[PDB]
Amino acid sequence: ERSELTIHPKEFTTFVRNFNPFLGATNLHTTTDFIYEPLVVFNEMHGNTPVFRLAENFQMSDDLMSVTFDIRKGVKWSDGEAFTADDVVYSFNLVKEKPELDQSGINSWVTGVEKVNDYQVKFRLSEANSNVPYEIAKVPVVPKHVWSKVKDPSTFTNENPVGSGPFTVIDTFTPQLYIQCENPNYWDAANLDVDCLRVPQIANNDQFLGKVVNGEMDWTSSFVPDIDRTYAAASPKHHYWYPPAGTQAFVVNFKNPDAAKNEALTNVDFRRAFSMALDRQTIIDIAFYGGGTVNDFASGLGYAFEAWSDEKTHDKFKAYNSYNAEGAKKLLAKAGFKDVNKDGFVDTPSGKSFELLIQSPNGWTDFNNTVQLAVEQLAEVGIKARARTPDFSVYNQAMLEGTYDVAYTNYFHGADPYTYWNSAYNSALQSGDGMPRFAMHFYKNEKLDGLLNSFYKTADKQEQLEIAHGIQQIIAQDQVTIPVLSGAYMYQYNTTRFTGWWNEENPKGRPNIWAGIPERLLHVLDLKPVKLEHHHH
Numbered sequence: 423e424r425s426e427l428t429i430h431p432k433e434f435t436t437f438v439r440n441f442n443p444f445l446g447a448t449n450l451h452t453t454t455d456f457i458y459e460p461l462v463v464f465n466e467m468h469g470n471t472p473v474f475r476l477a478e479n480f481q482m483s484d485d486l487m488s489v490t491f492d493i494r495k496g497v498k499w500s501d502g503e504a505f506t507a508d509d510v511v512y513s514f515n516l517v518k519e520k521p522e523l524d525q526s527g528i529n530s531w532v533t534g535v536e537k538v539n540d541y542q543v544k545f546r547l548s549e550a551n552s553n554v555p556y557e558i559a560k561v562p563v564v565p566k567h568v569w570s571k572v573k574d575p576s577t578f579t580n581e582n583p584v585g586s587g588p589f590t591v592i593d594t595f596t597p598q599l600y601i602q603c604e605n606p607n608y609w610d611a612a613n614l615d616v617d618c619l620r621v622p623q624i625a626n627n628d629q630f631l632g633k634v635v636n637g638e639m640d641w642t643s644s645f646v647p648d649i650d651r652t653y654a655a656a657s658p659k660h661h662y663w664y665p666p667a668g669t670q671a672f673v674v675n676f677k678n679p680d681a682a683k684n685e686a687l688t689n690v691d692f693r694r695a696f697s698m699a700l701d702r703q704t705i706i707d708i709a710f711y712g713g714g715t716v717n718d719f720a721s722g723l724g725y726a727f728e729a730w731s732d733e734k735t736h737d738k739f740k741a742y743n744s745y746n747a748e749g750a751k752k753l754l755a756k757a758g759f760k761d762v763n764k765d766g767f768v769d770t771p772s773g774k775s776f777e778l779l780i781q782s783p784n785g786w787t788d789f790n791n792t793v794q795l796a797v798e799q800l801a802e803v804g805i806k807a808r809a810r811t812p813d814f815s816v817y818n819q820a821m822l823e824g825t826y827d828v829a830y831t832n833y834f835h836g837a838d839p840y841t842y843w844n845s846a847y848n849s850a851l852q853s854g855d856g857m858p859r860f861a862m863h864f865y866k867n868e869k870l871d872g873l874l875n876s877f878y879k880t881a882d883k884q885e886q887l888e889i890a891h892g893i894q895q896i897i898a899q900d901q902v903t904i905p906v907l908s909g910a911y912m913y914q915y916n917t918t919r920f921t922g923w924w925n926e927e928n929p930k931g932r933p934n935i936w937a938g939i940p941e942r943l944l945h946v947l948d949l950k951p952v953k954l955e956h957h958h959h
């Protein structure tokens with residue numbers, strides 16, 4: 423009687439009812455896009471082509487110091503009230519007044535928002551930035567007529583959401599399953615053929631594997647080991663498409679509170695020897711079953727941005743980011759990391775023993791295995807390390823608070839190098855209660871920040887390329903992180919119950935179901951239920 427699409431955007435041990443789009447640490451990951459539709463979805467796989475949703479147009483000013491957005495008329499909230507400029511203006515003012523709700527750093531860019539009329543908003547910028555409509559689209563727009571009356575938006579759980587997107591009705595909710603049904607007032611209802619999102623609680627990759635192999639899922643983006651043998655071979659309806667994704671690296675804490683570990687981690691010779699100890703292709707072969715590409719760029723750029731790469735820089739530092747056990751041992755010796763207590767593990771120049779604790783998230787088994795391989799490879803050059811696999815929130819918090827030693831992490835990936843470099847190295851993103859982990863190495867370089875903040879400042883493509891080369895040089899020469907590989911956008915789909923999926927023959931955009939992939943809105947608008955085959959009673 424209704425089509426239910428079973429999706430898996432995020433692992434949870436238990437579902438807590440939270441649909442606050444600003445509360446990324448604690449909300450459910452079907453809130454953004456599916457409850458709160460964006461102004462615009464930029465199709466990152468297709469050159470950031472803008473797909474207009476609740477806005478029908480935007481227009482930048484002469485000098486890139488402002489931009490105006492035109493709001494689509496006739497759009498209703500799920501309670502029947504009108505979607506207008508009022509809501510956009512309020513949402514941005516809310517994030518400005520309460521910066522712990524800024525999860526992107528939008529406050530650094532937008533100094534003010536002004537209602538031009540009921541269907542146009544103007545944004546004033548702190549600085550010139552041709553990329554700011556992209557930034558603006560990241561901010562959730564919530565209904566002012568509801569949220570302005572809310573006690574405290576920063577602690578509002580929003581259990582009965584009023585939304586603009588396709589699925590706003592909470593049909594069923596249990597700690598282990600919830601079902602999110604069609605917005606009865608959805609502006610783009612004629613384009614939508616899925617009735618409900620069905621979201622089961624899955625805690626880790628182990629629990630996932632059993633369910634996906636058994637055909638219990640429709641749309642997922644989890645790591646699956648030996649995928650051809652385990653999942654694809656199980657049914658002719660089991661499909662996948664793994665387009666290339668972003669950089670993954672070992673990130674070291676430059677502000678480690680332990681004296682010995684700080685001494686090691688802040689030493690560029692040590693970071694380079696660490697990096698040379700790793701066998702990146704073996705990590706890809708074993709931990710990812712071949713699903714990745716070696717990243718031997720000291721700057722972490724990766725091979726998917728060859729038009730952008732300064733090949734002289736890449737070549738200069740590539741040796742430090744290539745498997746070379748003997749080279750690593752020789753460098754540790756030259757630097758003065760000498761074993762002075764006969765245990766085969768190097769000690770710091772001041773003579774102190776230490777063991778690096780390397781963390782990755784609990785249940786992210788491909789990363790867990792990567793870390794364990796690295797532990798073994800590090801031991802072969804005399805670097806003592808051991809693995810920890812803390813709960814994601816604990817993992818995350820340790821990075822935010824700077825209490826970790828080394829962490830393995832992936833990064834956002836975009837149509838140009840700025841998505842990675844800015845999110846991973848801009849020191850402004852090292853502070854703020856809404857900030858993610860990505861820049862939390864606490865390396866700070868003012869010249870680097872300056873180049874990043876200038877990337878979209880001139881409409882001059884050659885200058886922008888020179889800025890990129892400058893960024894690449896700084897990060898490479900300082901071996902700020904230890905890049906390992908370029909990963910994949912894991913994505914599995916089931917044709918048993920639905921058709922219309924994006925895939926290698928229909929590569930319309932990033933196909934993943936994770937929150938933070940706004941294209942998943944466009945994707946679900948393409949899916950159509952299948953007439954089930956008849957069976958007993």
Ligand SMILES: CC(=O)N[C@@H]1[C@@H](O)[C@H](O[C@@H]2O[C@H](CO)[C@@H](O[C@@H]3O[C@H](CO)[C@@H](O)[C@H](O)[C@H]3NC(C)=O)[C@H](O)[C@H]2NC(C)=O)[C@@H](CO)O[C@@H]1O
Nearest residue numbers: 431432433446643644645786787832833834936937938939
């Ligand atoms: C609050 C919010 O919207 N946060 C978004 C954040 O969750 C997104 O980060 C992605 O989250 C998914 C889910 O945890 C990550 O997918 C996992 O990758 C592991 C490593 O390969 C696999 O072992 C897991 O199987 C897989 N889990 C699932 C359920 O698919 C994904 O790696 C992660 N990406 C990054 C980068 O952190 C981001 C990006 O979409 O957006 C929001 O920040």
Ligand SMILES: [Ca+2]
Nearest residue numbers: 504508566567
């Ligand atoms: Ca209103």
Ligand SMILES: [Ca+2]
Nearest residue numbers: 761762763767
């Ligand atoms: Ca020793």
Ligand SMILES: [Cl-]
Nearest residue numbers: 582583591592
């Ligand atoms: Cl509801």
Ligand SMILES: [Cl-]
Nearest residue numbers: 661662663925
């Ligand atoms: Cl496919």
Ligand SMILES: [Cl-]
Nearest residue numbers: 719720721736
């Ligand atoms: Cl490089």
Ligand SMILES: [Mg+2]
Nearest residue numbers: 598622623624
């Ligand atoms: Mg269950």
Ligand SMILES: [Mg+2]
Nearest residue numbers: 611612614615
């Ligand atoms: Mg419809």
Ligand SMILES: [Mg+2]
Nearest residue numbers: 613614947948
């Ligand atoms: Mg459609």
